[PDB]
Design a protein around this motif. Structure first.
Motif, PDB file in Angstrom:
ATOM      1  N   UNK A  38       0.834  -1.190   0.000  1.00 41.82           N
ATOM      2  CA  UNK A  38       0.000   0.000   0.000  1.00 41.82           C
ATOM      3  C   UNK A  38       0.874   1.248   0.000  1.00 41.82           C
ATOM      4  N   UNK A  39       0.307   2.332  -0.489  1.00 39.43           N
ATOM      5  CA  UNK A  39       1.013   3.591  -0.579  1.00 39.43           C
ATOM      6  C   UNK A  39       0.531   4.378  -1.786  1.00 39.43           C
ATOM      7  N   UNK A  40       1.441   5.172  -2.339  1.00 40.09           N
ATOM      8  CA  UNK A  40       1.095   6.001  -3.474  1.00 40.09           C
ATOM      9  C   UNK A  40       0.774   5.184  -4.712  1.00 40.09           C
ATOM     10  N   UNK A  41      -0.014   5.800  -5.598  1.00 44.95           N
ATOM     11  CA  UNK A  41      -0.335   5.295  -6.933  1.00 44.95           C
ATOM     12  C   UNK A  41      -1.294   4.110  -6.927  1.00 44.95           C
ATOM     13  N   UNK A  42      -1.492   3.461  -5.784  1.00 43.96           N
ATOM     14  CA  UNK A  42      -2.416   2.339  -5.711  1.00 43.96           C
ATOM     15  C   UNK A  42      -3.739   2.698  -5.035  1.00 43.96           C
ATOM     16  N   UNK A  43      -3.999   3.985  -4.824  1.00 39.22           N
ATOM     17  CA  UNK A  43      -5.220   4.455  -4.186  1.00 39.22           C
ATOM     18  C   UNK A  43      -6.097   5.160  -5.212  1.00 39.22           C
ATOM     19  N   UNK A  44      -7.332   5.440  -4.802  1.00 40.91           N
ATOM     20  CA  UNK A  44      -8.150   6.476  -5.413  1.00 40.91           C
ATOM     21  C   UNK A  44      -8.228   7.732  -4.556  1.00 40.91           C
ATOM     22  N   UNK A  57       2.396  -0.349  -6.003  1.00 37.56           N
ATOM     23  CA  UNK A  57       2.600   0.742  -5.060  1.00 37.56           C
ATOM     24  C   UNK A  57       3.883   1.491  -5.393  1.00 37.56           C
ATOM     25  N   UNK A  58       3.802   2.820  -5.407  1.00 33.66           N
ATOM     26  CA  UNK A  58       4.960   3.647  -5.671  1.00 33.66           C
ATOM     27  C   UNK A  58       5.299   3.726  -7.147  1.00 33.66           C
ATOM     28  N   UNK A  59       6.354   4.485  -7.433  1.00 31.82           N
ATOM     29  CA  UNK A  59       6.812   4.652  -8.806  1.00 31.82           C
ATOM     30  C   UNK A  59       7.341   3.331  -9.349  1.00 31.82           C
ATOM     31  N   UNK A  68      11.418   0.639  -4.540  1.00 35.36           N
ATOM     32  CA  UNK A  68      11.301   2.076  -4.328  1.00 35.36           C
ATOM     33  C   UNK A  68      11.140   2.329  -2.834  1.00 35.36           C
ATOM     34  N   UNK A  80       8.459   3.225  -1.425  1.00 33.04           N
ATOM     35  CA  UNK A  80       7.172   2.679  -1.007  1.00 33.04           C
ATOM     36  C   UNK A  80       7.316   1.251  -0.495  1.00 33.04           C
ATOM     37  N   UNK A 111       6.747  -0.231   3.309  1.00 36.53           N
ATOM     38  CA  UNK A 111       5.909  -1.398   3.563  1.00 36.53           C
ATOM     39  C   UNK A 111       6.689  -2.474   4.306  1.00 36.53           C
ATOM     40  N   UNK A 142       3.944  11.582   2.829  1.00 35.32           N
ATOM     41  CA  UNK A 142       3.543  10.991   1.564  1.00 35.32           C
ATOM     42  C   UNK A 142       2.694   9.750   1.827  1.00 35.32           C
ATOM     43  N   UNK A 143       1.810   9.433   0.874  1.00 33.94           N
ATOM     44  CA  UNK A 143       0.877   8.322   1.055  1.00 33.94           C
ATOM     45  C   UNK A 143       1.586   7.020   1.406  1.00 33.94           C
ATOM     46  N   UNK A 144       2.790   6.807   0.872  1.00 36.01           N
ATOM     47  CA  UNK A 144       3.534   5.588   1.164  1.00 36.01           C
ATOM     48  C   UNK A 144       4.032   5.540   2.603  1.00 36.01           C
ATOM     49  N   UNK A 146      -0.359   4.907   4.634  1.00 33.01           N
ATOM     50  CA  UNK A 146      -1.254   3.759   4.498  1.00 33.01           C
ATOM     51  C   UNK A 146      -0.656   2.487   5.096  1.00 33.01           C
ATOM     52  N   UNK A 184       0.254  12.989  -3.933  1.00 33.48           N
ATOM     53  CA  UNK A 184       0.311  11.852  -3.015  1.00 33.48           C
ATOM     54  C   UNK A 184       0.399  12.296  -1.557  1.00 33.48           C
TER      55      UNK A 184
END
Ligand code: PLP
Ligand code: PLP
Lengths: 410, 408
Positions: free
Chosen positions: A254-260, A278-280, B94, B96, B100, B124-126, B129, B367
């Protein structure tokens, strides 16, 4: 083998496309089962992405390139719908097969496994298709069940019906063993798996580069393979899954790019496949993987399949002429896809590969990440040679001459 | 507001020529390095050279090890005898994935029901969450460090929110939206005093400021290679040796083991313990070349030049009456990123007009939606600077914003 068959593998129209082999023509690389060599077009595609496409800096392309890559990958494994449209939204990118199997074991295991359920794998499995199931079974209370081999290194129909029962929830079996070279009947295993109401997972890391793969003929629910084993770049893995199964499975990373959207206390997941990325991402590696698919398509994967069948037959045949060599897997070349494990009688695999390295022959020595299989066969260490379409008759003859040298010292 | 010598220093660009996508196309003003950087030629060449000459074994194995040592030295992970702590460097895809990994492994190891996980509203979202997920799984509580009027985390907020219940503290070193540099060393001191672990999201600080893990006193630190002129697909996680030994494995499978039976497995030593399956050895090799490229430019010169580029960018945006900076109006308080809005103009419209002028910025939530909700912003523009940027790139953004205002 016939004389026309030996003439086909004597010629080599492919090795010139690989810069490391064209620049080192004396080297016989026989460890493609670990990783491939890279075609020039694949190496150039990665550099071209960074030179001209990185972050769409020249927009006044890259986003469409990843979608075009998912579509070509989806086609390549037969993942097309009723109207011949590739199922691009069912292709998920990971770092390798290992991460894809960790994703499945964690996400599908949390979704489906209850105490008392069975997870069924085989004794042939690579470590990446064993330990994730060991972990998720201990966390959920499920039982890890092993399919056994018979004497010709096959899983029998009787073993399939006896181990996959009504208690089974997940079945994960390798398509082609990375040590024995055995090609398992994935279609028959999936039939029994679906009759028990269980999910079918396929480790296709050794089948995707060597044989034709069609996910709809294989009747599987999930399938994973690695790009670096089919002339793609390192760091790219592929997971295909049925659309509705991927929709129901919870996210992995989970993290960036995998959300709405995200709030302080919660988050809403993006749709598949972005839900599982998740992520770049490695956009350059994905782009070069699409270039590997285009390269293999240009050579015709059916002609690659036949040539690698001939190279596997020639490899076992020449190995059988050596009285001091014992093949660990089957003794029939038609039963080997890619890899042939063997041992020089009474010589450490470290000593075998050391002499072959002096003879410019690259092979693999050790456990090959299949220790439970080797324990089962009372082998502590083994040599492994593998063939790819860019190998030829001369590469195998170089192995045989090097093995004869090994016997001279030992 | 800065000297004529400082303006002269940023007009010259003694770095752009190393970047193929920018040097060959002088019409492009790339001001979105906070999302990802551009790649130098020596980095692109190193990746291709690996695939062409040592795609495997002895040379490749030693090349991976030298990359670990170069990365450890770059972040100050050296011992008393100045040897790089290469065995405390873990490779991921990365930042992220690294976060995790920490949230799952360290969360399983340390979190009890009733513990606090403290993050910042700047995260940041990473870095949000994975903590939301592990807190729900363990019964821990997620706590947020808040900002003052100057978009900073005060010592009062540090002492107030990080209490004895805290077990893990994960704070961004540099905000990817506000450019705020958080006092990680001071947060770590209070974190350790309360018996908690210190995790640092350094994705925005590793490319722009000097990072010394031993001076920061943190326990774990993560960043992405693709933000610091390295290839995509490579993340780095550093951690204290004793902690990484105690954290249970994350991904399992081949290459991260000493032995395996049908029912069990024994784990390999750190860092192999946390690297499952075949790694991107060419990307690791190219990341080492990115480190050597940055070392050759001297990182102190990169920092100094980027402080001037951010100060110029902030002062120039301040001269536009129709632009509102989302964050501190002081140029000296922005590391890399500067968020802003053209009033009554949607950021997607601003970005589309700048696209036609070959000006690349990032528009949307960046993000960091919880941060934007806290600031009562729905979406902003974001321009960001790197050492290969120059005064001409920023002036081209300022001109493009005048064109945006003339349209809307
Ligand atoms: C501050 C910060 N942390 C974490 C990340 C995640 O980076 P990546 O996409 O490489 O995983 C980014 C973006 C970032 O700016
Ligand atoms: C059969 C099989 N499964 C899984 C893997 C793991 O591949 P990777 O190292 O790319 O994760 C390999 C090796 C393999 O040969």
């Amino acid at each position: 083998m016939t004389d026309t068959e030996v003439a086909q593998i004597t010629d080599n129209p492919y090795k010139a496309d690989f810069p490391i082999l064209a620049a080192n023509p004396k080297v016989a690389y026989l460890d493609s089962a670990y990783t491939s060599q890279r075609p020039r077009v694949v190496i150039e595609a990665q550099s071209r992405f960074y030179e001209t496409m990185n972050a769409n800096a020249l927009r006044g392309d890259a986003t469409a390139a990843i979608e075009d890559a998912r579509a070509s990958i989806a086609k390549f494994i037969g993942a097309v719908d009723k109207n011949d449209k590739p199922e691009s939204q069912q292709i998920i990118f990971t770092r390798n097969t290992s991460e894809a199997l960790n994703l499945v074991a964690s996400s599908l295991g949390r979704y489906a496994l209850k105490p008392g359920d069975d997870v069924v794998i085989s004794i042939m499995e690579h470590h990446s298709n064993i330990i994730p199931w060991q972990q998720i079974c201990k966390a959920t209370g499920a039982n890890l069940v092993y399919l056994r081999m018979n004497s010709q290194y096959q899983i029998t129909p009787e073993e399939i019906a006896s181990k996959i029962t009504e208690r089974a929830k997940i079945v994960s079996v390798t398509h082609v063993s990375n040590v024995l070279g055995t090609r398992n009947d994935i279609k028959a295993i999936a039939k029994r798996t679906h009759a028990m109401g269980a999910y079918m997972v396929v480790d296709a890391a050794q089948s995707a580069p060597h044989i034709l793969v069609n996910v709809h003929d294989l009747d599987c629910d999930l399938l994973a393979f690695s790009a670096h084993k089919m002339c793609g770049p390192m760091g790219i893995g592929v997971l295909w899954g049925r659309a509705e199964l991927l929709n129901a499975m919870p996210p992995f990373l989970t993290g960036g790019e995998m959300i709405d959207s995200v709030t302080e206390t919660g988050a809403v997941w993006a749709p598949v496949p972005e839900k599982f990325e998740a992520g770049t991402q490695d956009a350059a590696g994905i782009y070069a993987t699409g270039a590997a698919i285009k390269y293999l398509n240009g050579l015709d994967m059916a002609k690659i399949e036949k040539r690698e069948e001939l190279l596997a037959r020639y490899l076992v045949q020449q190995l059988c002429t050596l009285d001091f060599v014992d093949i660990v897997g089957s003794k029939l070349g038609q039963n080997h896809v890619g890899a042939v494990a063997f041992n020089v009688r009474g010589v450490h695999p470290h000593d075998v590969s050391s002499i072959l390295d002096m003879n410019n022959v690259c092979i693999r020595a050790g456990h090959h990440c299949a220790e439970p299989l080797l324990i089962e066969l009372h082998e502590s260490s083994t040599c492994r040679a593998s063939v790819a379409f860019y190998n030829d008759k001369h590469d195998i003859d170089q192995l045989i001459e090097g093995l004869n040298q090994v016997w001279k010292i030992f």
